[PDB]
Amino acid sequence: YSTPKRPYESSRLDAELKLAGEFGLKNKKEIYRISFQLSKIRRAARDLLTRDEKDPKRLFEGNALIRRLVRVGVLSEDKKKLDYVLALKVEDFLERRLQTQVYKLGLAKSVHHARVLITQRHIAVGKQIVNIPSFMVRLDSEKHIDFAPTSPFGGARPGRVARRNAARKAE
Amino acid sequence: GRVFRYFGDKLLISEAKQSFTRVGENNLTCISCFQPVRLFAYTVSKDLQLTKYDITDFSKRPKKLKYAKGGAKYIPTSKHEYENTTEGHYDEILTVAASPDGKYVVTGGRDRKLIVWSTESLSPVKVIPTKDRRGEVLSLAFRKNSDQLYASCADFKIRTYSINQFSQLEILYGHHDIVEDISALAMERCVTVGARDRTAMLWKIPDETRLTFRGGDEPQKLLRRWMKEPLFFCEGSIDVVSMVDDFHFITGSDNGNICLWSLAKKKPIFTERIAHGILPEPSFNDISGETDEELRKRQLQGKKLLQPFWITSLYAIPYSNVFISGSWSGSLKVWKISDNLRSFELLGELSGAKGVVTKIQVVESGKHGKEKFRILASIAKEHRLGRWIANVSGARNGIYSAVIDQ
Amino acid sequence: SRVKKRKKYQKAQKKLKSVRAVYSGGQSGVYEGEKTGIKKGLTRSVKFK
Amino acid sequence: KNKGRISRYLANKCSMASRIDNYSEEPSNVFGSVLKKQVEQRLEFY
Amino acid sequence: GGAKVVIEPHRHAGVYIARGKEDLLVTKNMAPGESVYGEKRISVEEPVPPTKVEYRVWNPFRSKLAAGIMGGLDELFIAPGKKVLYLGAASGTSVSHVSDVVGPEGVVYAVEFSHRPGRELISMAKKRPNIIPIIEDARHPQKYRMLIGMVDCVFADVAQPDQARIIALNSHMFLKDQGGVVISIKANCIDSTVDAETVFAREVQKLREERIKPLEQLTLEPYERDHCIVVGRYMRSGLK
Amino acid sequence: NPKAFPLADAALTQQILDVVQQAANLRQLKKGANEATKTLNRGISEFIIMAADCEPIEILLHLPLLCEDKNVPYVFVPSRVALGRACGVSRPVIAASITTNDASAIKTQIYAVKDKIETLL
Amino acid sequence: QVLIDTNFINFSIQKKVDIVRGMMDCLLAKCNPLITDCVMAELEKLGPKYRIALKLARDPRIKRLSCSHKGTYADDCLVHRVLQHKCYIVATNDAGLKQRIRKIPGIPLMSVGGHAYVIEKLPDVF
RNA sequence: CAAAUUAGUGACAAUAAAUAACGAUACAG
RNA sequence: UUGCCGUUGCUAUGGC
Ligand SMILES: [Zn+2]
């Protein structure tokens, strides 16, 4: 990642305040990392617009870029134009992470409940338990985010607090 | 294995001995059969009963042998998803599957269980729950000449089992709606179809990889293709499969399509748009509520709300040249696939099955050049998943057996 | 570091109700009334030029 | 009870009948007949 | 629910405030003794004996104009003797309140295009005689140019993307010079690809291009997300 | 013009039914006619789907007047059976409603379907 | 959408930056540049020394607004129409207009600095 | 102010996580 | 040939 140009202006501070509060982020490094690679993405798409129609670079790298952006999921299926890559922005990228997605699918009650579910390993996309919150789920892994079968919020055996309370109430 | 049984035009069609043995079970749901290398069959219903039949008395109707009826007694005393280890079904058994060797039948439904019953006594030998809340099983298929079961569960999941070891092999993920149907042959490949994502996937199960096949018919380009000189349109939901051989399969859709797909082409090779007709439009005495026939006819909008029958059962005889389609048009259809394997074509109809066809499969007899088969088809008056079905037009809950010859 | 930004964003969006008027989600139940007063002298609308 | 929920059955059938009757332009009687048959079947079931 | 309030005249003529422990925007009732959309009423006994006259609570979550009034608009042009051309009289919800603000000596022309709302408009305009219901498309003012003459304010609660053209056509036909133009702009129904401030700026630019000088805009935010009322006057010569 | 006028063609119908199924999974769908009119007069609804072939038609034609009053898009799907099957319940439904939610993972899809049926309407 | 004024155009031509391409590689987004009629009046009043600047402002890619007031004071017009609406970027190089615009909140400010455009109060530039 | 090597010691803050999540009740203005 | 019930056949159908 890389720090911004003027990192301490008040619009940037209220921006990062709204982003970290609305998406449950821990520090500025999440925003700065995802915005750095978004800057690379649309700095490339700017050059793909500054070259002309029927350029080989524009044709092939343009449909390649919009198809892998659609498959990451930040771009919808119908807007297959290259100016929407310029209209893309940072919260379109961090709505795709797993903490945001767990909360939006409703397995958690807030983004903080989603973050602690993910870091306590109750969430598995597909086959594998994912355990970091900033995961960038894709458009095919969007619908298999569910509770892990190794976890008491799935169907598994209940954890140590529940079983110790059950044992002490059996005593 | 390619298509080595080229016999589509060979056998007779129009004079089958069709016996519709009506049974007293509300909404039969599945049919499982068996042949060694006496033949038994299995049915199961929405009334929570499994029923064993003998079928080997080929020239006459099948014979009831044994009930196995779950009920409200089998509701677990926990409501907890991993102590679901009871011995009977308390809700909506959807699918049966007989073993290729015939020691067991294995069944399951909306009670998210797999109960494996012995054949000789219809007794529950083992219970395997699917360990989560939405884990309702919707289709079961053994791979042929084996002891390995492929169940398709509504968690967008496909579970695999070894039945004689009472073990689960592999859970494999990747559909996008509920995996409404499954199909397998002797290879360790499998072919599943999820309902509304309009894709059929086939799974290399040891590699745990897949090939996806989407649909993609559009009424814009299709009506332009007809406009170069017409009631046909897009697609609702791919519903049923059967793997014909190890390079091709066939899919039954929600808009009455039957499609033929290869292992080497994403888009389908062949379509057949209307396969069982379009439904009778709702009557003018049951659409509007006005007095005059002119306004009650204006409330039909012409042809805009005629909906096609959807194929709710499809069965390809393995490696053969002929498959059978069934819905609530009353008449099963028999189609043969051409020898160049790029098209199929309607041979004939089997018109003695009034109701929804919740299952089709065939039973073989005769030698390499002279053959006769009995086509079993479970007939209900209600779709095998939800109700949704009005205008029950003379239906009965039975087993439509047909005896086809030559 | 996470709980601090959880609780300085809750403070910020409680201060935002003071400066603007925030769309809370529409009419909850029966329309009870304005619950806080109606000023007939104040006009909080942006005049042009 | 049964007497308490026949009121609810008759309520939602009566709302259905009033919708038919208002938004049809020159109404018939046949759907009021069918809903009367339905509610008498429901009360005779109890 | 059975409580007692004090009625007090607002700054705006023809509308009132009922102070209790929650105060209500309130209008006089032109058809006393019934409610039109289920709002609550207030019956005062004003002093032959005193007569029971009554008042109707204007609900800001069911009226963009009441949301504008109690957010604070410096000048409505809907006044107690005027003629208002209501465009998009989608039912009799706000047209009844505009009608009895305008009073018995003024006229509200309620233009609506759909037909079941038109049937309810005619049955409401029976008991409110100062409503002329006009069932016609506002995109063609010539189709009802014979029924309306020389209005004083236009109110536009249409929710179509060709809003500014509809407002301009109806104003050029029937509005008089330095008359009122009250617009309820819904950003999402104009277009949703741009933000709300972009579409409000474009609509205000369209109004001054059709020579309606905007005086005032209000976002009306606690009652509607991404709405606006723009109050302008029809200048007709010299926005400068 | 019939009574059930703004009917959708087949591509729009399948787009509508796919987002109906996803909202039903995400608990954002209120299904049935009187639940739909309840959520419509409450104001938590983004668009209403009526099926244009139930056994009366005025039984759900009461809802376009409500949608017109509150400026909500309404669209007619030509199959109550397919609408119930998309809703995920074991019966045909004749009307359904997409409730508003901003912690909703399908908001872009719902907004795209709203734009399509509003340019239709 | 970016409101231009006269010294921004003059500094663009003095630094050899294209208007729409300089805006695009400054913001990495698609820009719509707007010349108000008062900015255009000011460029025309600048005389026949500034013919190059006037007929570079006459560009079909640069859209143009219609201000409705007397006089041609572009700083007043830009300040009023930006504090009315808050959907505008202001591209300017006047020190006084830069101080006005960066004192009113929520308004990003663009300016020719060095050999390309810079942007300050827009918090999403990378 | 990193004298140990004869798979291990001998970091250059470079790297993704945590230091809590969800409820109930009471009392204030 | 079945949960009832009807025609039944001395086997096929049709209403819930
Ligand atoms: Zn100007």
Swiss-Prot record, chain A:
Entry-linked CDD domains: S4
Alphabetical list of Pfam families matching this protein: Ribosomal_S4, S4
Record InterPro entries: Ribosomal_uS4 (IPR022801), Ribosomal_uS4_CS (IPR018079), Ribosomal_uS4_euk/arc (IPR005710), Ribosomal_uS4_N (IPR001912), S4_RNA-bd (IPR002942), S4_RNA-bd_sf (IPR036986)
Localization: Cytoplasm; Nucleus, Nucleolus
S4 RNA-binding domain residues: 96-170
Molecular function per GO: rRNA binding; structural constituent of ribosome
Keyword field: Cytoplasm, Isopeptide bond, Nucleus, Phosphoprotein, Ribonucleoprotein, Ribosomal protein, Ribosome biogenesis, RNA-binding, rRNA processing, rRNA-binding, Ubl conjugation
Covalent link Glycyl lysine isopeptide (Lys-Gly) (interchain with G-Cter in ubiquitin), residues: K169
Annotated region described as Disordered, given as residue ranges: 149-171
PROSITE patterns (alphabetical): RIBOSOMAL_S4, S4
GO cellular component: 90S preribosome; cytoplasm; cytosol; cytosolic small ribosomal subunit; nucleolus; nucleoplasm; small-subunit processome
GO biological process: maturation of SSU-rRNA from tricistronic rRNA transcript (SSU-rRNA, 5.8S rRNA, LSU-rRNA); ribosomal small subunit biogenesis; translation
Protein role: Component of the ribosome, a large ribonucleoprotein complex responsible for the synthesis of proteins in the cell. The small ribosomal subunit (SSU) binds messenger RNAs (mRNAs) and translates the encoded message by selecting cognate aminoacyl-transfer RNA (tRNA) molecules. The large subunit (LSU) contains the ribosomal catalytic site termed the peptidyl transferase center (PTC), which catalyzes the formation of peptide bonds, thereby polymerizing the amino acids delivered by tRNAs into a polypeptide chain.
Gene: RPS9A
UniProtKB/Swiss-Prot annotation, chain B:
Residues of the full protein shown: 130 to 570 of 573
UniProt repeat feature WD, residue ranges: 88-127, 132-171, 174-213, 233-271, 307-345, 352-398
Keywords from the UniProt entry: Acetylation, Coiled coil, Nucleus, Phosphoprotein, Repeat, Ribonucleoprotein, Ribosome biogenesis, rRNA processing, WD repeat
Role according to the record: Involved in nucleolar processing of pre-18S ribosomal RNA. Required for efficient pre-rRNA cleavage at sites A0, A1 and A2, and biosynthesis of 18S rRNA.
Superkingdom, natural source: Eukaryota
Subunit text: Interacts with UTP25. Component of the ribosomal small subunit (SSU) processome composed of at least 40 protein subunits and snoRNA U3.
Gene (name only): RRP9
A GO cellular component annotation in the UniProt record: nucleoplasm
Protein name: Ribosomal RNA-processing protein 9
Curated annotation (Swiss-Prot), chain C:
Source species, domain of life: Eukaryota
Subcellular location: Nucleus, Nucleolus
Compositional bias of kind Basic residues: 1-18
General function of this protein: Primarily required at the G2/M phase. Essential for viability: involved in nucleolar processing of pre-18S ribosomal RNA as part of the ribosomal small subunit (SSU) processome.
Similarity-based family: Belongs to the SAS10 family.
Subunit description: Interacts with snoRNA U3. Interacts with MPP10. Component of the ribosomal small subunit (SSU) processome composed of at least 40 protein subunits and snoRNA U3.
Note: When overexpressed, has a role in the structure of silenced chromatin. Overproduction causes derepression of gene expression at both HML and HMR, as well as at the rDNA locus and at telomeres.
Descriptive protein name: Something about silencing protein 10
The organism's taxonomic lineage, starting at the top: Eukaryota, Fungi, Dikarya, Ascomycota, Saccharomycotina
Swiss-Prot record, chain D:
Taxonomic superkingdom: Eukaryota
Cellular localisation: Nucleus, Nucleolus
Self-association and partners: Interacts with NOP1 and NOP58. Component of the ribosomal small subunit (SSU) processome composed of at least 40 protein subunits and snoRNA U3.
Function description: Required for 60S ribosomal subunit synthesis.
Note: Present with 13500 molecules/cell in log phase SD medium.
Recorded family membership: Belongs to the NOP5/NOP56 family.
Full protein name: Nucleolar protein 56
Gene source species: Saccharomyces cerevisiae (strain ATCC 204508 / S288c) (Baker's yeast)
Record lineage: Eukaryota, Fungi, Dikarya, Ascomycota, Saccharomycotina
